[PDB]
């Protein structure tokens, strides 16, 4: 309702669920424990070009719950499903600056179909939130 920019750092509240790895065989009851590894890379472009350097290391969020993000500036994140006995399940390309905008287009949060190859897929659920006090770059 009431808006406002005193000067505070917006974060974005991103949570997966129902993921779906294409089940194939249904006679079995164990635990993989299966982890999605959440890379975090930051925005900089040298004498070379652009470039992206991951200064944020590996993130492990929750299952089927809502984790928290850090927004500074073309901010990127991804999400390759990793687990046992496998090198790769597959990956996707999500951005963490731009879909803080996305989500304010739908007057809060947008939904989202992530698209996991070559195989795999998910729903991204981007919320909206504001912060009291952060850090600032400099």
């Given at each position: ?9 917006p974060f974005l509240r991103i ?23 959440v890379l975090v890379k930051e925005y ?12 944020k290391?590996?993130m ?8 928290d993000a850090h927004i500074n500036k073309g901010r990127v994140m991804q999400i ?13 390309t999500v951005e963490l600056y731009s879909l803080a905008e996305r989500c ?20 991204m659920?981007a ?12």
């Amino acid at each position: 309702g009431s808006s406002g920019s005193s000067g505070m750092s917006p974060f974005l509240r991103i949570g997966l669920s129902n993921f779906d790895c294409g089940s194939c065989q249904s006679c079995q009851g164990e635990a993989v424990n299966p982890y999605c590894a959440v890379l975090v890379k930051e925005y900089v472009e040298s004498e070379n070009g652009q470039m992206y350097i991951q200064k944020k290391p590996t993130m492990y969020p929750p299952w089927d719950s809502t984790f928290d993000a850090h927004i500074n500036k073309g901010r990127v994140m991804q999400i390759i499903v990793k687990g046992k006995n496998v090198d790769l399940i597959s990956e996707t390309t999500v951005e963490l600056y731009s879909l803080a905008e996305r989500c304010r287009k739908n007057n809060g949060k947008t939904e989202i179909w992530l698209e996991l190859k070559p195989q795999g897929r998910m729903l991204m659920n981007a919320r909206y939130f504001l912060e009291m006090s952060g850090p600032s770059s400099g």
